[model samples]
Target: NSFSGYLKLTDNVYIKNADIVEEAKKVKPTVVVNAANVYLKHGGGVAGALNKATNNAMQVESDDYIATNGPLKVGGSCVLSGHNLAKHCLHVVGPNVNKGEDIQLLKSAYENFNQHEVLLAPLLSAGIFGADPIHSLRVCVDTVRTNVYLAVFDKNLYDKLVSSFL
Candidate 1:
C-alpha cells in the first residue's frame, strides 16, 4: 500500500522514506547529506550511520577536515569526497532547540544547497538536534532551490510529508 520512490512533491522535489545510506549506495542522486553537529563530529544518528556505512572513513575524513578547516557553524555546510557508496556528501550543521539555535538555522541548512545537482537531503535538525519532524520538513520544502529528494526514514512521517504538506 506504500511504495513511493522518488514521488514528486514539488518542482524538482521528491520524497522517500528509506535508508539514506543504502539509497546513496545504490541509487541515482549520488549526493547524500549528513545532518551533522556544528563541530562536524560523526558520532551518532545520520552522521554515524553514514560514517559506519562508508567503512568509518567518513569520520576520519571529517576529523581531518575539521582539523584543517575548523567547525561547520550552525547552518553552514561543506562537501566530502566520494567514500565507498556516494560520489560526494554534503555536511550541514543543523540547529537544535535544546541548544541556542532555532528553525531559521535549520532553514539556512537547506538554503545552503543553492546550486548543487540532484541531492538526497535528509530531515535536518529533527533527530538529535531536537527539532520536530514536521517543522523540519516545512523548512526543507520552503527553502530548497535545487533538485532534491527529501529522504526521510519514518513511514508515517513520510506519509504525513506527502499528505499534510501539499
Candidate 2:
C-alpha cells in the first residue's frame, strides 16, 4: 500500500499519490484532468498546483475564452494547455457534496473529460470540497477506462486507496 508507485485498480484504471508534475514528466499523458471550479480559475487545490507546475500559462488560456464564464456543469468540461505534462488539459467542475448529490456529480465530472489513450486525473472534489475519497475513487474507476492514472495528494486518501484495492 505504498503511496508513491502506481497501483492497478482494474484492467485499465491506476492510482498513485506522488508529485503529479514529476509523474507527468515521466509518462507524458495525452491529457490531464483538473478537478476545477465552475469559474475555471486555478486559484487553489489541485487546479492551482497543476497550473503552477505547468508554468502558470494554463490560467491564461482558461481566461482567454469569454464563454468560460458559464459554469462547467457536472457533466461538462473544457480543454486547454501548453506544457510537457500533456497536449491538452481537461477542466471539469466537480459537484459539491454538501449539496447532497456527491456521487452523481463526481461521476458527471469524470464523464465530462475527453477520452484519450493516457489521462492523468486528480481525486476530484476531494480537496476543499470534502468529498469522500473512496467514493470519488470508485466513481473514477467506473467512468474512465482509457489508461486512467489518478493522482492523489492527500496521504490518508492514498493509503485508503491502496488498502482498499491492493
Candidate 3:
C-alpha cells in the first residue's frame, strides 16, 4: 500500500509533559507511537486488587517490534508496557516528559534510522495516558513516510491525523 498525499510534521519535534489529546490540538500528525503495559488493573485498591495491573513498567526487549495481536507498551522514561492494547510499538530512544528536548530526540532517532519505508506502528495509551497527541504525532510524522500506517485506538485521532496529513 502507498499514501496518496500528505504533509510531514517535520523531524525535530518536541512536546513537554502533555496528554495525547492535548498535544494533538497543537502538533497534528499522522500517527502516534506509545508503549504501555500489557496487563493493568482497573478496579479495587492497590492492596485490595492483589496483583493489580501496573502500567509504569517496560517489557519490550532490544529487538525489532512489528505488528502483532498482543498488548503494547510505551518506551522511554520508566519504560512501561500494557495488555490488550493497540498495535505497533515504536521503540526508540527519545526525550522525556516535561523536558523541552522532546522534538530534538525524535529528530535524532529519525536520522538514526536508515530505512526509508517504515513499518506500521500501533500505540496503546498514547492519547488517554501518555505522550500527548501532538508530541506523539510529531514522532510518527517525522519518522514515517507517506506509506506508513498508524493503528490508533481513538477514532478521533485517526480523523485528525488524516485531515492534518491530507
Candidate 4:
C-alpha cells in the first residue's frame, strides 16, 4: 500500500566514487558509513537474486542502532586487507560463511558510531573476506556512507538496484 514509486537512475541523483567527497562536503554528513562489495549469489538462476535479497534484508539489522564510543579503546579496527585504504575497517572471522558473521560485525561497527567522519568498508565480496555481491549491493545502498565512496560492478547492476533508497 506504500510503495513510494521507483525513480530511475537518470531521474535520481547518483554519485560516483570521485564526486563522493565533493558531494559529501556539501551534505556535511554526521558519520560516513560504507557497505561495499557484497555478493549475493554466483551460479544459479533465481538463487543468486534470492540470495542477494536475503543478504540485503539481513543487513538492515546491522545498522538498526547507533551510539557513541569511549576512551582507551579505538573507535574502529583495521585487521582486514585493503582496510588501510578505508578510513576504518572492522574485521571478523564469522561463525559460518553462509550466515555472514563478518557482515554482522560490520553492522556492529556501524552501530557503535554515533557521530564521526569517514567510515570506510571495502566491497563485500571484493575483499579477501568476501560476501555475496547482490546482497552486498543492497546492504551498501541501505547504509548511508554519506561522505564515503565505493564502486559496484557496472551499469547494469547499478541500474537494477531499484529497492535501495525506497
**Every model's TM-score:** 0.91, 0.86, 0.37, 0.32
- Stretches of model 3 off by over 4 angstroms after superposition: 1-90, 99-101, 112-118, 123-132, 142-147
For candidate 1, which ten residues in a row score worst on lDDT? 1-10
Residue pairs that clash (backbone atoms under 3 angstroms), model 2: none
Q: Encode model 2's per-residue lDDT on 6-75: one tens digit a residue.
A: 7787987878777676666676777778878777778888788888887878877777743646556665
Query: Which residue segments of model 1 deviate by more than 4 Å?
Result: 1-4
- Models sorted by lDDT, best on top: 1, 2, 3, 4
TM-score, candidate number 4:
0.32
Off by over 4 Å in 2: 1-4, 67-69, 99-102
User: RMSD per prediction, one decimal?
Assistant: 3.0, 3.4, 11.4, 13.7
Leading candidate by TM-score:
1
Rate residue 52 of model 1 by lDDT.
Answer: 88
Model 3 scores worst on lDDT over the 10 consecutive residues at 45-54
**Per-residue lDDT for 108-157 in model 3, tens only?**
44432234233333432243243465556655555544344444435676
Reference-based lDDT, each prediction? 0.79, 0.74, 0.35, 0.32
Number of backbone collisions per candidate: 0, 0, 28, 15
